[PDB]
């Protein structure tokens, strides 16, 4: 059951990269945003091992979380990549640099508010570990030391920093769950 879902995890990684390829970046060994160079933006065969195992860890954690929640939308049904690909990649094309697997295109599936709540819970876990990183290291905020002004608006991982500010993460999760529903 892992291999068929491993293909979907690779497809989700492709979704993330062609979501950021279309911004206008380029393949590069040095991670720069304005200079258009990201090691994770390079082709699949030359991806760094650190980011690849981070992607694998996030994948397995997401499967465990969604199995705990009870939103099984894969494995049992046929997967949509490579040999049973749903031709989503060749459907739409963009002229930007990088690997360019051609951007996503999926209009055969819709979304349900149950998966919206599952997106909310995934955001709960993501902002939980984010706030753990911020608080354990004292980064982006400070009461005694005040490392930088304009402390983290979250503090509480989801109560104060609503989806209106984290629109990038919200749209990424929405596209991820739409693609997962379209996978099978």
Curated annotation (Swiss-Prot):
- Write out the PTM section of this UniProt entry: Channel activity is modulated by phosphorylation. Phosphorylation is increased in failing heart, leading to calcium leaks and increased cytoplasmic Ca(2+) levels.
Q: Where are the sequence repeats?
A: 1-89, 90-184
Q: Which tissues carry this protein?
A: Highly expressed in heart, lung, cerebellum and brain. Detected at lower levels in adrenal gland, stomach, thymus, esophagus and ovary.
Q: Where in the cell is it found?
A: Sarcoplasmic reticulum membrane
Describe the inactivation phenotype. Answer: Embryonically lethal. Embryos die at about 10 dpc, due to defects in heart tube development. Cardiac myotubes display enlarged rough endoplasmic reticulum and cytoplasmic vesicles that contain high levels of Ca(2+).
For this chain, the family text in UniProt reads:
Belongs to the ryanodine receptor (TC 1.A.3.1) family. RYR2 subfamily.
The free-text domain note is: The calcium release channel activity resides in the C-terminal region while the remaining part of the protein resides in the cytoplasm.
Q: How does it assemble?
A: Homotetramer. Can also form heterotetramers with RYR1 and RYR3. Interacts with CALM and S100A1; these interactions regulate channel activity. Identified in a complex composed of RYR2, FKBP1B, PKA catalytic subunit, PRKAR2A, AKAP6, and the protein phosphatases PP2A and PP1. Interacts directly with FKBP1B, PKA, PP1 and PP2A. Interacts with FKBP1A and FKBP1B; these interactions may stabilize the channel in its closed state and prevent Ca(2+) leaks. Interacts with SELENON. Identified in a complex, composed of FSD2, CMYA5 and RYR2.
Task: Say what the protein does.
Answer: Cytosolic calcium-activated calcium channel that mediates the release of Ca(2+) from the sarcoplasmic reticulum into the cytosol and thereby plays a key role in triggering cardiac muscle contraction. Aberrant channel activation can lead to cardiac arrhythmia. In cardiac myocytes, calcium release is triggered by increased Ca(2+) cytosolic levels due to activation of the L-type calcium channel CACNA1C. The calcium channel activity is modulated by formation of heterotetramers with RYR3. Required for cellular calcium ion homeostasis. Required for embryonic heart development.
Protein name (Swiss-Prot/TrEMBL)? Ryanodine receptor 2
Instruction: Please tell me where this chain falls within the complete protein, as first and last residue plus total length.
Output: 878 to 1061 of 4966
């Amino acid at each position: 059951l892992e291999r068929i879902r491993e293909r979907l995890a690779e497809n989700i990684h492709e979704l993330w990269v062609m979501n950021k390829i279309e911004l206008g970046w380029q393949y590069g060994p040095v991670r720069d945003d304005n200079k258009r160079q990201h090691p994770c933006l390079v082709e699949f065969c030359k991806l760094p091992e650190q980011e690849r195992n981070y992607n694998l860890q996030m994948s397995l954690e997401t499967l465990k979380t969604l199995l705990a929640l009870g939103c099984h939308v894969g494995i049992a049904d046929e997967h949509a990549e490579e040999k049973v690909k749903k031709m989503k990649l060749p459907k739409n094309y963009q002229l930007t640099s990088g690997y360019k697997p051609a951007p996503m295109d999926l209009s055969f599936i819709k979304l349900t508010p149950s998966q919206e709540a599952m997106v909310d819970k995934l955001a709960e876990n993501a902002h939980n570990v984010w706030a753990r990183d911020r608080i354990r290291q004292g980064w982006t905020y400070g009461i005694q030391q005040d490392v930088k002004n304009r402390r983290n608006p979250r503090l509480v991982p989801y109560t104060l920093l609503d989806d209106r500010t984290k629109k990038s993460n919200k749209d990424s999760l929405r596209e991820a769950v739409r693609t997962l529903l379209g996978y099978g």
